[PDB]
Design a protein around this ligand. Structure first.
Ligand SMILES: *C/C=C\c1cc2ccc(N(CC)CC)cc2oc1=O
Length: 133
């Protein structure tokens, strides 16, 4: 299924620390953020998507159209400019963020009532799992 709509509660978070250090996130910010649980609210209509990821310390919003390149400024994270592109590989939603860092992006999919989000940067991979609220 290609339908990520809804509110998603984090159930599992693996190696968020390695991801954030690959982004060179500062120390005080990093080890507050590795404690946190996230909630995702996603609105998907065709190619149009809107994320909103929330926590008590770090929040992240992105809006994009699948198959349209867009410039992203990751002000809430590492404060870098990247050229982002989100496309479909089968039923997996794939984002590439062309920038200074190699292999930066994320992937995603639904595995029967659960949402999986994989964040990558350099040789680091963080895996997050959410349940549909
Ligand atoms: C997928 C749906 C878009 C959406 C993307 C997204 C990317 C990254 C994150 N992070 C929170 C830890 C990484 C900084 C969250 C997020 O949420 C979304 O809903």
């Amino acid at each position: 299924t290609r339908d990520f709509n809804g509110t998603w509660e984090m159930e599992s978070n693996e190696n968020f620390e390695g991801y954030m250090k690959a982004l060179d996130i500062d120390f005080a910010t990093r080890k507050i953020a590795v404690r946190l649980t996230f909630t995702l609210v996603i609105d998907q209509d065709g190619d149009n998507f809107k994320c909103k990821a929330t926590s008590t310390f770090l929040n992240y919003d992105v809006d994009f159209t699948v198959g349209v390149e867009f410039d992203e400024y990751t002000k809430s994270l590492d404060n870098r400019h990247v050229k982002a592109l989100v496309t479909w590989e089968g039923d997996v939603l794939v984002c590439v963020q062309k920038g200074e860092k190699e292999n930066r992006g994320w992937k995603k999919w639904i595995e029967g009532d659960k949402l999986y989000l994989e964040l990558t940067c350099g040789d680091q991979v963080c895996r997050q799992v959410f349940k549909k609220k």
